[PDB]
Amino acid sequence: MANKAVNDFILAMNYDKKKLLTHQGESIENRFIKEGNQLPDEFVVIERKKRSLSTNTSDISVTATNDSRLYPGALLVVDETLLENNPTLLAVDRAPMTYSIDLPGLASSDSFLQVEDPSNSSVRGAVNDLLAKWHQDYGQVNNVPARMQHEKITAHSMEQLKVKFGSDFEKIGNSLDIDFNSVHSGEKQIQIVNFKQIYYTVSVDAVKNPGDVFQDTVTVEDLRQRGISAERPLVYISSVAYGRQVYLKLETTSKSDEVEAAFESLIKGVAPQTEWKQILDNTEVKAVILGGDPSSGARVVTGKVDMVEDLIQEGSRFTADHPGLPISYTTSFLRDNVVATFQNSTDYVETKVTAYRNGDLLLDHSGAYVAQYYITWDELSYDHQGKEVLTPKAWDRNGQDLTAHFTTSIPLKGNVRNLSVKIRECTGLAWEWWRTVYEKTDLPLVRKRTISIWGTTLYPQVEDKVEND
Numbered sequence: 408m409a410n411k412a413v414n415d416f417i418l419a420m421n422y423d424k425k426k427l428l429t430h431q432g433e434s435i436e437n438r439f440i441k442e443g444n445q446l447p448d449e450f451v452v453i454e455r456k457k458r459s460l461s462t463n464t465s466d467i468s469v470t471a472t473n474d475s476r477l478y479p480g481a482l483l484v485v486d487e488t489l490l491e492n493n494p495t496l497l498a499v500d501r502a503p504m505t506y507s508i509d510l511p512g513l514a515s516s517d518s519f520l521q522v523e524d525p526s527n528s529s530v531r532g533a534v535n536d537l538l539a540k541w542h543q544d545y546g547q548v549n550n551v552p553a554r555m556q557h558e559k560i561t562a563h564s565m566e567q568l569k570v571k572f573g574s575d576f577e578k579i580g581n582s583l584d585i586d587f588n589s590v591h592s593g594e595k596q597i598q599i600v601n602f603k604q605i606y607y608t609v610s611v612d613a614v615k616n617p618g619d620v621f622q623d624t625v626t627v628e629d630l631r632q633r634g635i636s637a638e639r640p641l642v643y644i645s646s647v648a649y650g651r652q653v654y655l656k657l658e659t660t661s662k663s664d665e666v667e668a669a670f671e672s673l674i675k676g677v678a679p680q681t682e683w684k685q686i687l688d689n690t691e692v693k694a695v696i697l698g699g700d701p702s703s704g705a706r707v708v709t710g711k712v713d714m715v716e717d718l719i720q721e722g723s724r725f726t727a728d729h730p731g732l733p734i735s736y737t738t739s740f741l742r743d744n745v746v747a748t749f750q751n752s753t754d755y756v757e758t759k760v761t762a763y764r765n766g767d768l769l770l771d772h773s774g775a776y777v778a779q780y781y782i783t784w785d786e787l788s789y790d791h792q793g794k795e796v797l798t799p800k801a802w803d804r805n806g807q808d809l810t811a812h813f814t815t816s817i818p819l820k821g822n823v824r825n826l827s828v829k830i831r832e833c834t835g836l837a838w839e840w841w842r843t844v845y846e847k848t849d850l851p852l853v854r855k856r857t858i859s860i861w862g863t864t865l866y867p868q869v870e871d872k873v874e875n876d
Contacts, residue, residue, distance in 0.1 A: 409626045414618030416627045417742050420637040422485075424745065427640075430490045430574070432566045432753025441793035443822060444593055450763040450787075450821025451662055453593040458563075460570045461752035467492060468573040468601075469652075469733045472703040477733050478527040479609040480504050481644045482620060482741065484635065489642070489738075490749065492575040497641060499629060500622035501525045508534060510607040511552075512545040520609075534609055538727050546727040553604040553650060553699075553725050557674065562590060562597035562656075567755040572601060572654075574751065582707045583656040583693045593760045596666050600655040600674060602718075603648075603734050604699060606725035610646040613744045617641075620741065642738040642747050650731035651699025651722035655715065658693075661686040662762035673715050687712045694718055701729045763821030766852045768828075771859040772813035774867055776832040778844070778860060781805050782817065784826040797824060808833075811861075819852060826850040834864045845869045 435457050442453045469477060470492070476483070482497040483489055506520040517540075520533045545551065560571045562585055569576045589595035614620060620643065635641060657670050669683035670690075679687055692714055696706045699722025708714070725731070738747040772778050782805060785797035802817055819826065830845040844860055844867045853875035862868035 408623075410618045410621065410623050412627045413621055413625060413630065414616050416630065417617035417641070420640050420742055422637050422640055424740065424747070425750065427485050428490065428747055429750040430752075432570060432751065435754040435756065438756070439793065441789050442593075443788045445820060445822065446594060448765055449662065450765070451593045452761045452763070452789075454759045454761075455591075456757045456759070457754055458757045459752060459754050460567050461750070462570055463748055463750050465737050465746045465748045466735045467737065467749070468576075468735050469697075470573070470575050470578045472698065472705060472732060474733065475527040477644065477647065477736055478525070478530045479506055479644055479647045479736075480522075480525045480530065480611045480620075481527075483642050483644065483738060484633075485640045485642055485740075485747070490574060490751075492573055497630075497633060497635070498526075499625050499633075502620055502622055504620065505612060506530070506533070507610050507612065508537060508607055509610065510538075510541065512549050513541065517541075530609070535730055538730055542727050546725075551725050551727070553606055553723050555602065555604050555723070557600060557602045559598055559600045559674070562587070562599050563757050564753075564755040566753040568599060570751045570753050572599070579654050579695050582695050582705070583654065585656060586658065591756070591758050593662070593758065595658055595660055596662070596760065597656065597658045598667075598670050600657065600670075602653040602655065604651045604653075604722055604731075605648045605734070606650040606699075606727070606731040608646055608648045611643065613739075614643065614741060617741050641741040643741050644736050645739040645744075645746070647733050647736045650725070650734050652697040652734040653718055654695040654697075655718070656693040657690055659686055659690045661689055662760045673712060674719075676716055676719075696721075697734065698732050699729075703732045763852070764854060765818070765820045766823075766854050766856070768817040768819055768826075769855065769857040770813070770815050770817070771857065772809055773811050773859065773861040774832060774844075774863070775811065776834070776864045776867065777808045777810055778813075778830055778832045779806050779808060779841075781829040781831075782827070784819065785824045786820075787822040787824050821852070823852055826852060828858060830858070830860060830869070832860070832864065832867050836864075842867065845871070847871075851875075 438457045440455045444451050476496040483494040484497055488495050501524055503523045504525050507518050522529050522533050565577060565580055568580055586595055590597050659666055663686055665682050666686055669686040672679055690712045693709045740747060782802040784800050786800055788796050790796055827848040831841045831843050834842050853873045855874040857872040859870045
C-alpha cells in the first residue's frame with residue numbers, strides 16, 4: 408500500500424537536525440580601530456570592534472503579508488530556502504487534520520477545528536468562520552486584549568539585524584532606510600525595535616505517524632519526484648501566531664550615554680527627563696506596520712518621536728473586527744515531532760561613540776598693569792593604529808605685554824586636552840618684577856570659561872567663571 412510505504416520512507420530517514428538548520432553569516436577578520444572625527448559643535452572619538460552575534464530559535468518571524476505557504480499544518484522542505492525563510496511548500500494531497508485555536512474566552516468545545524483538505528484558504532476559512540461566531544458572544548461584550556512581546560537591538564550591520572530578527576529581515580530593513588554608514592562614521596545612533604501583538608494562535612497536535620498527513624493516493628514516487636529524501640526531509644508548521652507586528656527604527660544624531668534610556672522611556676511612554684528631551688527632539692522615526700488593520704499589506708511610515716505612543720496601542724485590542732495575519736510560526740520535523748531550531752550567526756563591526764563638546768576660553772583684562780598670558784594645551788587625535796597622539800599647541804599671543812581693556816575669545820575644540828593657563832602681571836617693583844595672578848593646569852574643557860583679571864600692580868584680582876549647562 409502507498410501510505411505504508413510513505414510512512415516507512417519518512418521513518419527510515421536519518422539526518423543531522425542541527426547541521427541542516429545552521430547558517431553562517433559573513434566572516435570578518437578581528438579588528439579594532441580608534442578614530443577621531445571633528446563635528447561642528449563636538450569632537451567624536453569612535454571605537455570599532457569586530458563582534459559576533461549568534462541566535463538559536465524556533466520562532467520564525469513573518470515579514471510577508473499574504474503568504475499562502477504559511478498555514479498551520481503546511482509541509483515545508485528542509486533546505487537552504489527554509490533557512491532563508493523562503494520555504495518550498497510540499498503541496499501534495501493532504502489528509503484531514505485537526506487544529507486547536509487559542510483565544511481568550513472559549514470553552515475547549517469550540518476550540519477544535521477539523522479541516523478536511525488542509526490549505527491556506529481552507530484553514531483560513533475554518534478559523535475566520537469560528538472567529539465570526541466568536542465576535543457575537545465574546546469579542547464585543549468582553550474586552551479581549553492582545554498579547555504583547557517586544558525585542559530591541561542597536562543597529563550595526565544588516566547581517567547582524569538578520570541574525571536578530573530573521574533571515575528575510577531586509578524586506579523590512581530596506582523599507583526603514585537604515586543609515587549604517589552614519590552609525591559607522593559616528594554621527595548617528597540607531598536602535599531597531601520589534602513589537603508583536605498576538606491575537607490568537609492556531610496549533611497542530613503531534614502527528615502520530617508521518618504518513619498521517621498524506622491522502623492514501625500519495626506515493627513514495629511522488630515525494631521523491633519533489634526531491635524529498637534524508638538529504639531534504641520534511642517539517643510541518645506546528646503553530647502560527649496571528650496578530651499585528653511593528654518594526655520601529657529610532658535614529659538619533661546624539662552621541663550620548665543616555666540614548667538607550669531615552670529610547671526606552673519612549674517605548675514605555677514614560678515622561679522624558681531633560682537630558683533625553685534633547686535626544687528625543689533630534690530623533691527620526693521610520694516604521695513598518697504589518698497588519699492589525701484591513702487589509703493584509705505593509706505600511707511604511709516616517710514621523711516624529713511623538714508617533715510611537717500611537718503605533719503601539721493602535722491594534723492592541725482584539726475585538727476581532729478584522730482577524731490578524733501571521734506574525735510568526737514554528738516548525739516541527741514530520742519524522743518525530745522534534746521542534747526545528749535554527750542556528751544563525753554572523754560577525755559584525757560594532758561602533759561605540761564618545762563625544763567631547765567644543766568650548767570657548769574668554770579673557771578679560773581690566774587691571775592697571777601689563778599682563779602676560781601663557782596658555783598651552785594638547786590637541787588629541789589618533790594615528791592609523793588607533794593610538795593616542797598629543798600635538799602641543801599654544802595661544803598665538805603668549806608672553807606678549809597686554810594692557811587693559813583687553814578682551815578675547817579663544818575657541819577650543821573638543822579634542823583639546825591638558826589646558827594650562829598661567830597669568831602674570833608686571834608690578835613695576837625692581838625686586839619683584841612679575842607676580843603670578845593665575846596658574847592652573849589641566850583645566851576642564853567647559854562650554855564657556857571666562858578668566859577676568861583686574862585690580863592694581865600691588866593688589867591684583869582674578870575671577871575664573873565657568874558656564875557649563
